[PDB]
Structures are given as C-alpha cells and as structure tokens.
C-alpha cells in the first residue's frame, strides 16, 4: 500500500474527525507524496504483506484533504477518524500526530501548526479547573491584570532569606510570588520547609494589607514527588502550583490535572525548554499547538511572550496565542496568558493597550531593581497598572506615587 | 551615614576561560551562534540563565548565590558558530531529579533572543550527581540472561499495518512472528488501548500465546508492549504486564516526558520489568544540527534514569542516518560508565535479512534489531520472514555467506531473490 | 552514673534480672538449636567468611566470590560491618543476585 491512498483533496471531513495542520518541505519526493507519508505515518502506516489485513485499519486511515503551496513549502490539512485515538489520552494523540513524522527522511522540515479536536474528542478533557474567572474570584481581583514576580537572583535563597524577600514583594503590592523554573528543592531550601514558612508569611501579609496573596510554587519533579508537593501546598492553604510542563511532560501533566482537581489547586504552566522545538518556523511544534494541548488538559495560566521596547517576540504570533487562550471553546474555561520578559512600570500602558487586562504580568527584574528596593518596585508596578486601567498619563500619576516616579527616571 | 551596596551581576562575569573545573562539577557542552552580541556575551547568557541569572538590586544577596554560578571555561569557533563548555556546581541541582537538571540546562536558554541558535551537545555528570541514579535495572547482560540469548543480536517486529488490529487478529500475527523465530513482538508507538483492542484484554491474550510459543519452540519470547499514557494509567498497565508474566514494557519516553519516566523507573524496579524506550517526537528537537538537544544527550539522560534499550537509528540505503553520529550514540550506550549498566541500541528503519551482515559488521552483536516490513513482507508470510531474519543473523555471526546459507534455508533464499526483483 | 565527678572510674560488670523482669523478653528466636536445624548442621561448628577486601565490590564481583566461598564449603557468607548499600552495590540488587547464587550452590 502507497502514500497516495492517504490523499484525497476533494474529501470533506465530518464534524467527528480530528484535523491537524502541518507545514512541510519535501525532500526528493512530490508535495503530494510527502503529505501522504505524513498521513500514513500518523495513522495506519503501510501494509502489503500476504497477511490478513485487520478489519479496523481501513476505517482508521488519515486523509490529506487540503494541500497548497506556502512560502518555501506547503501546508497540508489532514483528517483523522477517532478510531485512531485513545480518548482522553493527549499523550497518545501526540504519539500519533507529533511523533515519528518529524523524523521522516522524505521531508526536509515538518511543523505541526494547529489541531482541531471534534466534540467527541474534546468532551473527554475538562479544561482548566478555575481559568480566568476562577482565579479572579479566589484572588479577589475583578478587573486589572495580576502581578507576579520571580526574585532575583533566581537561585540560592535559604528558606529564611526567601521568606524575607517574599514579605517585601507581597507587602509592596505583588499578587503572586513566583519561583524560578530551576528553583525546586535544595539542602538549603527544602520544599516542605519552604511551604511551612512561606504560607505563614503569605497569611501575615494578607492580614496586614487586606489583599489576597498567592504563590506560584514550583512543584516540578518526578511525578510522585510533584504529587506529594502539591499535597503539601494544599494542606498549607495554597491555591496554586507551578509546573514546568515541557520539561516534566505530557504524561505527568495529565495526571497532575487529576491531582489538582482533588486538591483545589490552579496550575501555572511554565514553558521552559519549549523553544527547543517551537522557535524554528520550518520545523517542530508551534507554541499555539502547545498552548491548545495545555489548555485542553487544563492549565489555568501559561507563559506566551511579550512586546517590549528592549525585549519583544512576534506580536502577531503572541496575540494569536493569547486570543486562542481567552476564546470561547465549548466547556473549556479560558486561560490567563502570562506576560514576562524585561517588563517594568513604564511598559504597562502599552502592554495593556495591546494585550488587554486579562494577563498575569511577571516583572521581577524591574521590581527587584527599583532604586528604593523591591517593596517600592512592587508598588511602582501596581501604581503604573492602575494608571493604565484608568487612562491616566504615567507622569500625572507620578505626582502621587513616588515609587512609580523613581521608576520612570530610568 | 549609611552606605548601601547595589549588587550587579552581568553576562561576562560568567565567562572565565582560565577556570579549571573540579571533578565534582557538572559540565554541559553547547553549540551556539550569537545574534547581535559577542560570542563571549552569548556564552555568558547561557551560563547565566542556566544558573543564577543576572540582576541589579539593593536587596541582600542570598549567601549561596555566589556558590551557585555557572562558569564558561571553554569557548572556541566551530563551523558557523561556537562551542562553549560550561561548569556547574552541584549546589544548583536537586539531586536525583533529571527533570530539574534539564529545567536548568535545557530550559529558557533555547528561547534567548541574543542567540540565533542553541544546541545542547552533551553533559558530563560528576560522581556525586550520577550516584543518585540507578541506571538500567537489566541492561544488556540482564536482558540477555532472561531472554536466554548469549551472543547474537535480538530480533523484534512491529506488525504491519501498525493500527487497527483486534485482540484476536493481533494474537494470530503474534503467533506467526514468534513461532518463526522473532524474539520480541513490538507494539507501534501509536498503539495503546482502543475499544477494539483494550489493553487489559490484549495482555491476557497475548501472554497466553507467548507462553504457548515458548512451550512449542523451547525459546524465550517477549513483548515490548506499549504502556504509554497518563502516568497513573502507565503504572496500572505495567502492573498488569508483570502480573501476566511479562518482563518488558515499552514507553514512548519523549511524548510521555522525563517526569513520568523517572517515576516509571521506580515502578519497574518493583515489578522486575525492563524498559524499551521508543523515541517518537525526538526529531522535533534532535534533527536540526544548529538547534535543540542531540540524540546523544537524550540517550545519556535515558540511560542514567535507566531505560534498558533505546532506538538510535541505522545504516541502510533505505534509512541511512549519519554513520558517525549513530556510532557515537551506540558506543556511549554500551560504554562502561561507573555503576550504570550498558543499554541495548535498537536498530530500525527498513531492515531485512540481506542487510544483516553489514549491520552487524558496522554496529556489533549487541543490538536489538527491529525488522518490520522485511518480516511482514516476506513472500511466504510473516512466519517465513522471521525465519529468514534469524537465519541471516546466524550466518552473519558465523561468517557464512548469505547465498551459502540460503541453500539450507528456503526462507532466506526467497527473501534474497525478492530484493533483487524489487531493486531498480 | 558514668559521668559523676565523685567517681574517677565506673564499670558496669554484670546485671541479674529477676524472673518477673526477664519473662517480658523472648530471647533468641532460633539460638543454637534453631540455627543448627535450619542449616542442617548437627555437631560441627559453622563457618563464615567476609570477603577481602572489605569494600568496593560490585554485585557481579560479589556474586563471583560468594560462589567460590560457598562452593568450597563455607556455610555462611558474611558482609563486612561497613558494607551496607552503595551506588555500585545496591542492597536490593545484591539480594536478588546473591540468593540466586546461594540456591544454585545448594543445588
């Protein structure tokens, strides 16, 4: 059996079939053959063999129904019957549509652009437990973006040193303390010691300020360890855990979604390592597909990138990802985009004008750098956010917030 | 009259080309190309973002920050870029957690605007890092022992087509493959559990067939059964396999991920199961020679945690990946490495009986040889194909010409004739 | 009592528990007779050997020395007091191998 049996550019996919879109460049074969190879490798493969062909194999063939020239290559869209899939298992879906296909010698490059799961696939995924509205409610923040802050330096803090910095950041106005992706558990900062202490400091600051404060605490590890750590956070009164979802990976993430369902924890998804496969525009998996999978399983917050006078990724791509994350999508609650990357108070209006108010804004570097110290930097960050939301020029505001003034000089 | 200290840390402070790392530091080798910054600055950015980062702050530095800095100690031009080697103190690591190691050395660094491209080439764990990994439970010698196969490569076959089989149809093809001489039935990376082939129904049936073939042939047969799934599911499926008498599970380790793998290694330690790692999805990040993570590094992580066998690529006409790269990976997999047992390279990609002499000459006898199409495609059927593969391997090992062997092996004779009829 | 400044030296020589104290102790499960019975050795003393050197053996190297010792007539293989569990000789890996060797030598 041959690759062109998987190609039919007149086929019209049913509403119960899953669609994957790929960019590809052929290597020594026709665009049609290459697309047929993708469909084959991601479904039943080849046969031809004197052996009895299994009865479900014809009903499991993928079909390329769209193929067009695009830049230096081609886009194919391919339809997949649900007989190919273990329903509820994102892991098995990606084993099919994002696996061996990337190694095929008959392609120069292959990029998985997007996928579109039908109702009968999507209904076996819960999506986020809280999402934007869930978080807004437990944080008590109805309208403005939320603020987050990873301390600098990002490693090396003892439990006590971390308690002290956390008190300054939260007290100065930060909503969310954030651990660095590399900051898990060390001899001088054991995870359970950190939990015991940091939630007591959190509760003290809530009592002194009257505002809800939370901790994007890094539970990343071997799954059994991440589960135990999630249990410790819940037992101490935490409503968030942070997981490096790409480093940890899809099998752990799906299970952890069941763990956090029982313990009432929102998931903050850090995407470290993503750029190993999401950066190259000709090859890998797009950040959009990654986000879509992550939203389906049910992260409540995820990093996507920013636009920024020093930093800044592709505006269009970021806005496409964010629009998807906030979009209506059947029962799947919307996800907060997390904006990070050289953010500081002066950038807040624009970040907000361009990306809206439904954001978690991570700005630790600017907060830690304030000339009056971290607590003043946090206020400067809340103070320029309030001004964006209200339509006030940052130089007017600065007349009644010297922590923002001191920030604007630089 | 207070004098305060603004602490400043910058990228070039992470570069010291005269630094001599201790034997108890972890070393990572990177290839990179700078974008708009000096090679020094780029290298510094890597060391920084994989360690303590940079910053400007009045706040008191945490005491362990200065002892947690990575240092660039080697930096030289390489092709259109540069190689850096970077040294890491173990204070930066949660020991036993490869998840955390990779979050540091293989994380945010790949997304840095100031690098055009970034590839992690290799890493070298010091003894005090490595000693908190068990490595493979069985490795080469353990598998050889339970399979009862002392010298020759082992054989494996994934049925064709790769999806759609009912439990009964899969039992019938398995009987053929095993009976004709294949050592290891192998599930496709996509083939987990379906309405028409439920995992637990498949285990009950196939291990009965397995045991029947063992009784009939006097040879040990095994099954690289795909337990890939959400971690709890993978765990339950591993328990079902062990319960039925199985000694192997297959995990799609890249799609599943490191966190699940590390835990599954504890599960399999308890159940006596060897792990066959399928690497589907790797090429999304291992294929670009300028950017990503090499198959060698992935393989090293997987060996350290403890997969017992892993796919590395082959040298064929019809699948030839780079000979140099592949041989490097296999050499590593099989090399002495403290207490870490050696791992079988799994060779796959259009193999058939006529390639066995070349495959063995070039890559040795310590291989698992997966020969799907070649076996399933034999003109006399899959049983005959399996025999042809086993006979070609016995000949390669004995230094006997394939056409000489074919005189006492009808299956091998037909297989050889077909290649010629299907070759341009 | 050992730290009292009013004593220059103190040595506990022996103690003698009365029946109502001693009765709340089981003593050995096996003792001499229990051991002789499960070892199948009725009269002669039993023999034991700790390998030399005392440390540094891998599981497989430890299996090979044990085979020699047991096969030549030693009754009891013995670990050195410092030999617990190491990266190159993990206790559970040792247990699995050494008892298979043990059963082989018995056969």
UniProtKB/Swiss-Prot annotation, chain A:
The modification N6-carboxylysine is found at residue 178. InterPro entries: RuBisCO (IPR033966), RuBisCO_III (IPR017712), RuBisCO_lsu_C (IPR000685), RuBisCO_lsu_C_sf (IPR036376), RuBisCO_lsu_fd_N (IPR017443), RuBisCO_lsu_N_sf (IPR036422). Its EC number is 4.1.1.39. The record marks 310 as: Transition state stabilizer. It catalyses: 2 (2R)-3-phosphoglycerate + 2 H(+) = D-ribulose 1,5-bisphosphate + CO2 + H2O; D-ribulose 1,5-bisphosphate + O2 = 2-phosphoglycolate + (2R)-3-phosphoglycerate + 2 H(+). Keywords: Carbon dioxide fixation, Lyase, Magnesium, Metal-binding, Oxidoreductase. The active site is at residues 152, 270. It comes from the Archaea. GO terms for biological process: AMP catabolic process; carbon fixation. Mg(2+) binds at residues 178, 180-181. GO terms for molecular function: magnesium ion binding; oxidoreductase activity; ribulose-bisphosphate carboxylase activity. Binds 1 Mg(2+) ion per subunit. Its cofactor is Mg(2+). Coiled coil: none annotated. Substrate binds at residues 154, 271, 303, 340-342, 362-365. Disulfide bonds: none annotated. Belongs to the RuBisCO large chain family. Type III subfamily. Because the Archaea possessing a type III RuBisCO are all anaerobic, it is most likely that only the carboxylase activity of RuBisCO, and not the competitive oxygenase activity (by which RuBP reacts with O(2) to form one molecule of 3-phosphoglycerate and one molecule of 2-phosphoglycolate), is biologically relevant in these strains. Catalyzes the addition of molecular CO(2) and H(2)O to ribulose 1,5-bisphosphate (RuBP), generating two molecules of 3-phosphoglycerate (3-PGA). Functions in an archaeal AMP degradation pathway, together with AMP phosphorylase and R15P isomerase. Homodimer or homodecamer. In contrast to form I RuBisCO, the form III RuBisCO is composed solely of large subunits. This is Ribulose bisphosphate carboxylase. It comes from Pyrococcus horikoshii (strain ATCC 700860 / DSM 12428 / JCM 9974 / NBRC 100139 / OT-3).
């Amino acid at each position: 059996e041959w690759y062109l049996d998987f190609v039919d550019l007149n086929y019209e996919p049913g509403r119960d079939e899953l669609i994957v879109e790929y960019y590809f460049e052929p290597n020594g074969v026709s665009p049609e053959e290459a697309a047929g190879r993708i469909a084959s490798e991601s479904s039943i493969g080849t046969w031809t063999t004197l052996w009895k062909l299994p009865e479900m194999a014809k009903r499991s063939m993928a079909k390329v129904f769209y193929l067009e020239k695009h830049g230096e290559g081609y886009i194919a869209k391919i339809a997949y019957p649900l007989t190919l899939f273990e329903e509820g298992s994102l892991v098995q879906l990606f084993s099919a549509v994002a696996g061996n296909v990337f190694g095929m010698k008959a392609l120069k490059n292959l990029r998985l652009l997007d996928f579109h799961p039908p109702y009968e696939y999507l209904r076996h995924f819960k999506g986020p437990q809280f999402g934007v509205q869930g978080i807004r409610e437990f944080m008590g923040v109805k309208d403005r973006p939320l603020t987050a802050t990873v301390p600098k330096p990002k490693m090396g803090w003892s439990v006590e040193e971390y308690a002290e910095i956390a008190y300054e950041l939260w007290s100065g106005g930060i909503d969310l303390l954030k651990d660095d992706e590399n900051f898990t558990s060390f001899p001088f900062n054991r995870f359970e010691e950190r939990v015991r202490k940091l939630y007591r400091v959190r509760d003290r600051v809530e009592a002194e300020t009257g505002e809800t404060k939370e901790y994007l605490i890094n539970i990343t590890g071997p799954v059994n360890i991440m589960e135990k750590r999630a249990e410790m956070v819940a037992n101490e009164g935490g409503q968030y855990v942070m997981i490096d979802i790409v480093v940890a990976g899809w099998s752990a993430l799906q299970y952890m979604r069941e763990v956090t369902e029982d313990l009432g924890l929102a998931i903050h998804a850090h995407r470290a390592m993503h750029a190993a496969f999401t950066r190259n525009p000709r090859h890998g998996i797009t950040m959009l597909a990654l986000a879509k999978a992550a939203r389906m399983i049910g992260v409540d917050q995820i990093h996507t990138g920013t636009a920024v006078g020093k930093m800044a990724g592709n505006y269009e791509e970021i806005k496409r990802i964010n629009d998807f994350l906030l979009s209506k999508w059947e029962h799947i609650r919307p996800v907060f985009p997390v904006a990070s990357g050289g953010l500081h108070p002066g950038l807040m209006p624009e970040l907000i004008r361009l990306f809206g108010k439904d954001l978690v804004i991570q700005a630790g570097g600017g907060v830690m750098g304030h000339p009056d110290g971290p607590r003043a930097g946090a206020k400067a960050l809340r103070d320029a956010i309030d001004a964006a939301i209200e339509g006030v020029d940052l130089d007017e505001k600065a007349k009644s917030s010297p922590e923002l003034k001191k920030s604007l000089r630089e």
